[PDB]
Design a protein around this ligand. Structure first.
Ligand SMILES: [Ca+2]
Length: 223
C-alpha cells in the first residue's frame, strides 16, 4: 500500500497473509474454512496466516493453517486478468475470535464514489521498493466505469473496477495482490492489477467480487 497508514494490530481481522516460505499475497477470510484471493496469486504449497499484524514477528494471535485445496476461477484468464479470483480451503477450520473473523460477501455491487478499505503488506513506495512488516491500510473511492475504461483503454471488463486517486500518491501495490477491498462492510474487491503503483492517471484495478457470489457459494457447497 503506497500513501496509506498503519492499520493497528488485528483491526482488519479478515485479512490473511498467504505464505510459501515468505509472504507473497493477501486474501480475505469469508468463513472458518475458506479464503478468497486473486487467481494470479496461485502457488502450490500455500500456508494461510490469520491474526497477523507484523508478518515477521510471532506476536501471539496468529493461526497458521495449511491450504488443502485451491480453486482458480474456471474462466480466469492470466493474460487479461479477467476473473482474477481464487478460493483457498483451509486444512482445518480457523478459530474465529475478535482478531480472526470473516468478512461478509456482498448482495449488491458497490456504488461508484464509495470509500473502501484496502489493506496489505505490499510495497509502500511508488518509485522504488520498501515492504512493511505491519499491515497497512488505505481508504480509496471506487471510480466510475467510464473513468476506469479511459485510464486503461481496451483492458477493463465488466468483472473489474478501478479505485483510488487519479492524481497519484495513494494505491495498493505489489504484495497486496489478493487482499481485500471492503466497502460498507462487504468484500467488494480483490487487489488485482494496475500500471505501476500510485502513478498519475493509473488507478488500481480490482476484481469485482459481486459478480462471483454465485460461483463462490456453489463451490463452497461442493468442496
Ligand atoms: Ca506475526
Amino acid at each position: 500500500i503506497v500513501g496509506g497508514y498503519t492499520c493497528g494490530a488485528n483491526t482488519v481481522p479478515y485479512q490473511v497473509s498467504l505464505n510459501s516460505g515468505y509472504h507473497f499475497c493477501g486474501g480475505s477470510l469469508i468463513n472458518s474454512q475458506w479464503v478468497v484471493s486473486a487467481a494470479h496469486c496461485y502457488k502450490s504449497g500455500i500456508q494461510v496466516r490469520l491474526g497477523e499484524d507484523n508478518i515477521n514477528v510471532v506476536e501471539g494471535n496468529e493461526q497458521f493453517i495449511s491450504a488443502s485445496k485451491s480453486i482458480v476461477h474456471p474462466s480466469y484468464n492470466s493474460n487479461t486478468l479477467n476473473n482474477d479470483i481464487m478460493l483457498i480451503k483451509l486444512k482445518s477450520a480457523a478459530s474465529l475470535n475478535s482478531r480472526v473473523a470473516s468478512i461478509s460477501l456482498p448482495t449488491s455491487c458497490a456504488s461508484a464514489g464509495t470509500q473502501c478499505l484496502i489493506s496489505g503488506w505490499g510495497n509502500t513506495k511508488s518509485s522504488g521498493t520498501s515492504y512493511p512488516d505491519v499491515l497497512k491500510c488505505l481508504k480509496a473511492p471506487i471510480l466510475s466505469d467510464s473513468s476506469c475504461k479511459s485510464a486503461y483503454p481496451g483492458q477493463i471488463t465488466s468483472n473489474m473496477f478501478c479505485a483510488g486517486y487519479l492524481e497519484g500518491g495513494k494505491d495498493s501495490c505489489q504484495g497486496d495482490s489478493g487482499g481485500p477491498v471492503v466497502c460498507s462492510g462487504k468484500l467488494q474487491g480483490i487487489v488485482s492489477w494496475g500500471s505501476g503503483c500510485a502513478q498519475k492517471n493509473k488507478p488500481g484495478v480490482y476484481t469485482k467480487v459481486c459478480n462471483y457470489v454465485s460461483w463462490i457459494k456453489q463451490t463452497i457447497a461442493s468442496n
